[PDB]
Design a protein around this ligand. Sequence first.
Ligand code: CLA
Ligand code: CLA
Ligand code: CLA
Ligand code: CLA
Ligand code: CLA
Ligand code: CLA
Ligand SMILES: CC1=C(/C=C/C(C)=C/C=C/C(C)=C/C=C/C=C(C)/C=C/C=C(C)/C=C/C2=C(C)CCCC2(C)C)C(C)(C)CCC1
Ligand code: SF4
Ligand code: SF4
Lengths: 80, 144, 733, 152, 68, 68, 141, 11
Amino acid sequence: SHSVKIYDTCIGCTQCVRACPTDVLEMIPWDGCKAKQIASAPRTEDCVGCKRCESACPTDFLSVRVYLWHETTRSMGLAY
Amino acid sequence: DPFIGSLETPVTSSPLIAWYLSNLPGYRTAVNPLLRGVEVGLAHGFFLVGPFVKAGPLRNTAYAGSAGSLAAAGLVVILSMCLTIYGISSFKEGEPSIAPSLTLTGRKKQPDQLQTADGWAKFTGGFFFGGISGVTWAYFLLYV
Amino acid sequence: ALRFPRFSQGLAQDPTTRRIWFGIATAHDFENHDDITEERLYQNIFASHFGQLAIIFLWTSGNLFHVAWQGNFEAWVQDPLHVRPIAHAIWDPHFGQPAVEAFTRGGALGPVNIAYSGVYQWWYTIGLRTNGDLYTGALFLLFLSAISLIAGWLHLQPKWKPSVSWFKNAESRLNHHLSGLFGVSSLAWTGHLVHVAIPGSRGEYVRWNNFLGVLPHPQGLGPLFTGQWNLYAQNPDSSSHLFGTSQGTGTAILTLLGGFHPQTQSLWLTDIAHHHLAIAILFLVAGHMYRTNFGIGHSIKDLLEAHIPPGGRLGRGHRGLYDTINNSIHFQLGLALASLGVITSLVAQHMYSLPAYAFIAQDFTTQAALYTHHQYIAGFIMTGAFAHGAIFFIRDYNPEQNEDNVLARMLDHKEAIISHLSWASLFLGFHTLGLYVHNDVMLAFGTPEKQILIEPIFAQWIQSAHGKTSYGFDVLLSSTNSPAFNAGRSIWLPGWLNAINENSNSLFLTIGPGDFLVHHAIALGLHTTTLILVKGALDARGSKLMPDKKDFGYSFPCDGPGRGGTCDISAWDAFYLAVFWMLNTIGWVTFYWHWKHITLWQGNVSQFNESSTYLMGWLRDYLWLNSSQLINGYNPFGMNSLSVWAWMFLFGHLVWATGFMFLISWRGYWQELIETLAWAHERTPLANLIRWRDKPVALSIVQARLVGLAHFSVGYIFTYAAFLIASTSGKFG
Amino acid sequence: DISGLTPCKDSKQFAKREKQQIKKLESSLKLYAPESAPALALNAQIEKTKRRFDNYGKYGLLCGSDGLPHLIVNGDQRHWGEFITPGILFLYIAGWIGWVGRSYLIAISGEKKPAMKEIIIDVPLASRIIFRGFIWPVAAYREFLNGDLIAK
Amino acid sequence: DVWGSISDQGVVTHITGGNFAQSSITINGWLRDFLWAQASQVIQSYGSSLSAYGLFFLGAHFVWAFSL
Amino acid sequence: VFSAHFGQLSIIFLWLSGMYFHGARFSNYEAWLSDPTHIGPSAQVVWSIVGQEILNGDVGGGFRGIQI
Amino acid sequence: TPPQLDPNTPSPIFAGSTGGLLRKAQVEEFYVITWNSPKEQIFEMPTGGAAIMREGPNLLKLARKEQCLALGTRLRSKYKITYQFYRVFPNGEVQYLHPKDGVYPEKANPGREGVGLNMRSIGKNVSPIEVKFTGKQSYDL
Amino acid sequence: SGANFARAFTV
Ligand code: CLA
Ligand code: CLA
Ligand code: CLA
Ligand code: CLA
Ligand code: CLA
Ligand code: CLA
Ligand SMILES: CC1=C(/C=C/C(C)=C/C=C/C(C)=C/C=C/C=C(C)/C=C/C=C(C)/C=C/C2=C(C)CCCC2(C)C)C(C)(C)CCC1
Ligand code: SF4
Ligand code: SF4
């Protein structure tokens, strides 16, 4: 399973949550920004590594990072 | 069930085709695997004898039949070795069989004993014996 | 922990077929194994070294035994110029009658293989004359392989296992390697040359049984200890000496004659013995520099810390470099690989102009094969040096402990170095291509006199300085009166000038307008390859497109399609790109050498001098002209002994063309194809009783790139080797 | 003379090559009518070949052993015009181009959107800038001494 | 096997001698008798009225190598 | 789409007109008409600027030009 | 929210296709998506082709989570229909997967724990030399 | 045919 980490540079624009095709990320309330919310990645074991979340993230460098790791049936996307 | 990854077509499910395929030695269930292996080996050896004796490097000499029969025997031996290796690597000893236990009607049936260590071993032994017998019978018939 | 990759659980958990591939791929990478420590890594490295030594010794033993058993050494030593060496016998059930008839060469009773490795001349020179010596050597090397394996197993034991602090004792290792490994070995080889090789060259047979009852020099050891060493050079070998016999010989064992042996066109054995003696003395004297347990010597860390320039133009200088070098193994590997590559290139450049083996200048195919082989090995090693430097920068570099020293300053200003390398490569490529195309068009229109031909003035001046009088300059050794000519005239100049001023040999060949452009092309290739490798090494830690490259590792596929798309962004991809340029440059160099030497050997040097200035000359007068005999190995009319070379030609072509598969097409299409094939196999009758254990998946991206590169290299190497050997063997001149 | 070369007005291979080319042209000349246009064209070609050979001989080049002229980039005073005299000229012209381009870029750095001026050149300002490069060495040297050549 | 020349007597001499039937069953035959033999006119056209064909022959090779 | 089709038709007609004018002006059609077997067609003539005049090969019929 | 059940829901009208379930469905797992449609209308299946969804509750079986999510997001975007899918094992266990809190993840809701949060910028991570010879990774700290 | 060829070499 891959590893998805959220850093504190986030501004809570909800784009990464919408972009995910496997329902990995979600948003929780926070107090470190104006939008008063941050992202989190509970269902990491479902991540397929498509890196769509990193494509839609406005920041000098991305506040959500995906590191590829040990592969498995779910993360590889095998239908058989 | 439409959502299963298969289709119902005239060729896939026909009375003649289903009857023919359900009578082949590899598809019987209540029969111990040794006899089915013997039959399969006999058929395969008798089929295999031909091309080696017909298109080999010694097809134009007087040594065509013996060389072809020996080549067919070697192929049968190699196939038996491959079958034994696959049986060792795939099935375990004490575990039950992994064959389906119900038919299209849904009526429960005894699982096939071929998908087991002892069953596959019997099948491979029968196949080896049948292949050798078929090869030698074809050699006897062709050049006598 | 359960499946085949016992050294990595992550590779054992996944059920696809990539587990096998990645288990085979990363077996020797001891840093990534789970539960690894420094001690285990060092001990595994030690055991691997021992195994490699055993393999090398077994290889040379097998070579010796096969030449002894299936060769014609005894018949070859009598008539060196009129007997073809035999490598080993051929047994093949697939061979037809004409193949058996055609391959029977030499004096054998069956098919054999002509040996182009050149071991016959080496073994003849070092003093072997019968097959008993070869059998004895084979047994000795078998014993050496056995003892190497035994030592490896012994040192893997718990009781004899060394500790980490032992491995990092740099000063003692340097002292012992400089004094014992180098100096003593050279001294022993000098002893062998004095005792066996030189007397064996004059007809006296010295062996183990009776080497105590013979005197290498009639005076003995008296002159050496007295001080009159000159007595060892009183009677040199006469100019009419015949190798292997006792006609017109002398008694000296250490000389400084210089030049080549007249009959064999090789270096004198006395000169070689003297050179080895001097080198051994120098190494023995120089090996006592560093401090050890006896309280005197030098300390390396204090040597490094003291070299900091006042004024701070270099910053902190060399402070902290000792620990950086010691604590990291990739730094050591990179340094060793760079040195080995330079040494290999030196060997390749020297062994063709100053041959040291008897009757090797008359064997053209052996010379060509040896030169090409050594140059390719040198290129690969030089690429590996930069690869391991980049790995070091990724893994073992600690920014805090190397603050403001030379490494930090290097990481500071990468942009200037990259820009200047790019400028130099652009300049060279632009102008070389322009000159070549202009010459080609001028020849195409039918007017050769409008060509651009530039004389290599500087190289010709260098050759004139060395003592060549074929141009007109009178500088240094060329001039009759000069401090250098007077200083060196009494010892070695009389032979050196005669050797260099002949036209047959390959020592300092004449050069004209054709060599200028080829040298500039070689420089362009070197600059471009260096640019690629240096950029990959310096941009490993990070850049502007991805400033956290050190977290993902040395090799990773990509970073998605975002930010415009980032393919081939890692340093592994920089190495994979630089391999192609290395191959291209080495190919250019080998083409130049082969064409120049074949034109020289064939008799006329005007063909090269008139057809090397435009590219159609290379395409028509080198490849097309010389492929005539190679492509005719087998035809509808028949076949001859060149059939195997044509077959390997086609084999190399096929492999090279197959590489394009993996180098062009990418993963998704093949994954979809595998999807469909899996459905087809699962849905068929009489074949669904068999089920797979590993789910079939397409190859990864980096794996596909590696496979394509391997195919490319194999095809390239095999095709060129076949062409070179067949073309040089067809005419034997 | 230099590096064992022969002066191009004394070598024989030069004359042999000239004769070969002239004979090759005259072989094709014979086919057509003497008054026809192809005859005039071939006569012009022959005249051009003869003039080129005479000019090459008179210019003081050095043919080699095989018969072709060789260029000397060494720096001898007898070959000033072989490499050194043209090369300097090139640099001049080349510098011109570079200087002009640089100036134009600065001339559009003031505005808020220089991209529009980069993709759609303006002719008045460019024509004003073009002729300032005729004295590029002097301006470049003065800027280097002042220190405005390098950004800070 | 089709093009060629005919004489007054009646015999027909083809361009390549009719070797397609026996030499085209091997890859070596396609490389030697077709690519190697028929490329003589392309490369030996320098200094003649067909030099542009050789120039384009080299230029196409350059572009093909450039594409990689 | 209609307008683009019309533009393409105009370009094709211009190309055909150019080919016909080249056949009319710089060609040896009248020479080829009488003796077609021994004369090579040619409808392009090269200028004499640099040394490219060697491209004006002798096709036949008292003409020099690039064979078409 | 309490997870629901899918006892006896019928299925959409289909003619069959070769992109359905495979041996993995019998061996490893599959997924079941349920929704509610106000009218009988034609939609497009993720596997391939077109099908017709009936009025009332509709249930479907799929092989991967991505197919379920793609069909669900198409339903949400085009038809304005809520949906929910579960995962089914060969042993009969049913696991509720889509919205666990009863609310789509794009909207914040109190009661959600933070997972995998690093309270530093992406450029404050340590170098790989710091974490060498240990199992942990630089970004994990 | 000569005039057509001469048209190119008028200058
Ligand atoms: C070191 C490399 C070496 C190599 C490449 C060869 C190569 C060859 N051998 Mg020779 N040979 C060698 C050493 C070697 N030999 C030694 C040490 C002996 C003494 C036992 C012989 C004795 C020998 C005989 C008696 C014969 C050959 C023959 C042959 C040929 C056919 C191959 C075969 O039948 O193997 C035969 C090999 C052996 C019976 C034993 C050799 C194996 C040694 C013990 C170890 C090799 C280990 C290898 C390096 C694995 C390392 C793994 C590592 C990469 C991880 C082939 C040219 C045959 C021939 O004549 O055909 C024309 C044959 O009749 N060889
Ligand atoms: C004086 C005694 C001594 C000696 C003889 C050696 C010798 C050696 N050590 Mg060292 N070592 C010593 C002391 C000594 N050590 C001490 C005290 C320590 C503790 C600090 C170490 C620590 C140590 C380690 C940790 C390791 C070694 C290793 C080795 C081996 C090097 C590999 C190799 O064979 O290269 C061959 C070397 C030479 C022949 C030198 C020649 C190189 C030049 C460039 C030759 C130029 C080529 C020339 C033209 C030849 C012609 C070719 C021919 C075919 C014609 C070798 C057995 C390595 C190994 O292999 O272990 C098994 C290794 O792992 N050593
Ligand atoms: C002096 C010895 C030497 C040593 C000890 C090392 C040591 C190391 N290298 Mg370095 N390296 C060297 C020389 C050396 N290298 C050279 C000369 C090069 C230039 C090519 C490189 C370039 C290099 C790269 C590019 C990489 C390393 C890496 C590694 C590490 C992993 C090893 C491994 O997994 O490979 C095991 C490899 C194999 C078993 C599979 C490949 C086998 C090749 C492709 C076979 C080619 C096919 C064959 C010839 C077919 C013949 C067919 C027949 C018809 C002829 C290891 C620490 C790897 C790393 O990531 O380290 C951190 C890494 O990726 N090295
Ligand atoms: C033979 C074909 C070929 C050629 C010509 C090049 C050329 C070049 N390579 Mg590439 N390369 C190739 C194949 C080739 N490569 C392959 C197979 C690989 C493996 C993937 C690479 C990988 C590679 C790498 C990794 C790098 C390069 C770089 C370079 C540049 C090196 C500097 C230099 O040589 O400038 C000489 C310049 C020229 C010869 C270019 C041609 C000039 C043209 C002909 C002039 C325009 C004239 C004309 C009017 C055209 C009009 C067009 C028409 C439509 C009007 C240069 C552009 C290096 C780099 O970028 O350095 C800056 C570098 O980093 N190459
Ligand atoms: C130059 C060599 C080359 C070769 C041999 C192939 C081979 C093939 N291509 Mg690839 N391809 C290439 C270059 C090449 N390609 C290039 C440059 C591209 C552009 C990117 C592609 C892109 C491509 C696509 C897009 C597709 C293929 C497909 C195919 C396959 C077609 C089916 C078939 O004919 O295979 C049968 C095998 C051969 C004809 C190869 C020769 C084998 C002979 C008989 C020797 C066998 C020897 C024997 C078994 C050896 C055993 C000994 C050993 C145990 C030691 C086949 C694997 C198609 C495919 O996969 O669909 C089926 C397809 O979809 N290729
Ligand atoms: C406008 C003027 C201009 C100037 C002053 C420079 C200046 C420089 N270039 Mg750059 N460059 C330019 C345009 C320019 N460049 C363009 C248009 C390109 C894209 C083709 C490049 C691409 C480029 C590369 C790839 C490299 C440089 C490098 C360099 C440096 C070394 C010199 C050299 O190698 O030239 C190289 C020159 C070229 C390859 C072609 C330049 C010729 C252009 C077409 C002329 C400028 C014309 C312009 C349209 C005029 C408009 C003004 C008008 C409206 C009034 C130097 C700082 C080198 C380096 O980095 O050195 C540190 C290097 O690696 N340049
Ligand atoms: C990445 C990296 C790396 C790598 C690097 C490299 C790879 C390098 C190389 C380098 C090289 C490869 C170099 C070379 C050099 C050389 C030289 C420096 C030479 C010199 C010479 C001389 C000086 C000579 C002289 C002379 C002559 C000329 C003649 C005779 C006389 C005399 C002797 C005087 C490392 C590992 C570090 C680590 C870090 C990073
Ligand atoms: S896209 Fe980036 S900035 Fe926006 S919520 Fe997700 S992590 Fe935060
Ligand atoms: S990589 Fe893809 S699946 Fe994984 S969290 Fe990002 S968007 Fe979701």
